């Protein structure tokens, strides 16, 4: 079994992430995650807070995951790339997910709160069984540092 | 066992993809795929049709794969990058493979039909046993939607 | 078991890579590797020699690995990206590791010898047990061509 755990850490965030235990019966590799906020991306590098904590589990243990762009992210309307190609998150990290996005255009670019620019892929490309959305207050032992 | 299935969906395509059951005894991760057509890549984003359908199989089931640049793709002659870093293709997709390629240069760039700009890597980085090239007419149950 | 083998192939290199058998008890996916030399990256593509040979082993056999940027690589001070998104190295390759890095800025950029711009991830994202740093002279059968 491979499971994902997402907890919003802001009010606007929990709007887009109502508590559920979503299953993945389509056998989709990637877990889409929302921007949760209208932002303007300037030419060059931008830091985009995702307002969530995330844990991935494989065969009972805490595991790593990768952040990868969706096809949607880069159009003729917005030349956006993930700065580090794909983000690796080690099992040890328990802070907020944050993206480095390069706007390659010479003019600024707007993204909308509902948009999913990236998806989360489990270490080793293991398809997730459930995506557990937790509510803001509930303190998982998974997000405790060590 | 991990096997790949490639079917050309155009005449010029089947030129480069004669029906075979290629084996991979070198233990190469990546399956090189040709452009099949002379194209000119303008500054900014370009959509590059690959004129093939592709299925990947691991342990009997249909599985996902990733599209990754080859070292060849980006030279001093052509600043080309894959727009989404690496393409993830879910098992469910059965249409034509298409690339988003960013020309970072300020002048247009020519690619030739014989050139392999990208390779296909099986979900979980599993080395393929055989690369089955199918012929244009043969209707695999693998490319049937569900 | 998954093990990494790094051998410096220059004197300045062995400075940063003293012979050890480092273990990875943090369960980190990525093996950080140093630039080993002050270089200036011009706008456009740059080739960055890493002055090491590397082998990866999974379950006794020689295996493949991937080169991925660290978060550190791209800042507001330096718009650097890996040109091929992530580097795949086939088990067969036994030469020096070399990076293609795109400086997206319009002015040149300095990197310092101690800096780790990239990390090595084992095929299939398998966490390494030990990182064996070998010394310059010792001829591993792993770096012999076939």
Residue numbers in the entry:
A (entry chain A), B (entry chain A), C (entry chain A): 2 to 147
Q: What did the authors write?
A:
ASFV dUTPase (aDUT) gene consists of 495 bp and encodes 165 amino acid residues. The results of gel filtration experiments on the recombinant protein and static light scattering measurements indicated that ASFV dUTPase is in a trimeric conformation, which is consistent with the results of previous studies. Ligand-free ASFV dUTPase crystals grew in the I213 space group with a subunit in each asymmetric unit, and the structure contained 146 visible residues (residues 1–146); the remaining C-terminal residues (residues 147–165) are flexible. Comparison of the prereaction state and quiescent state showed a root-mean-square deviation (RMSD) of 0.519 Å for the active sites. These differences are evidence of the conformational changes induced by dUTP binding, as active-site residues are rearranged to provide a tight pocket for the substrate. Comparison of the postreaction state and quiescent state showed an RMSD of 0.364 Å for the active sites, suggesting that the conformational changes are also beneficial to the release of the product. The results of the thermofluor assay showed that ASFV dUTPase was denatured when heated to approximately 83 °C, whereas swine dUTPase denatured at 62 °C, indicating that ASFV dUTPase had better thermal stability.
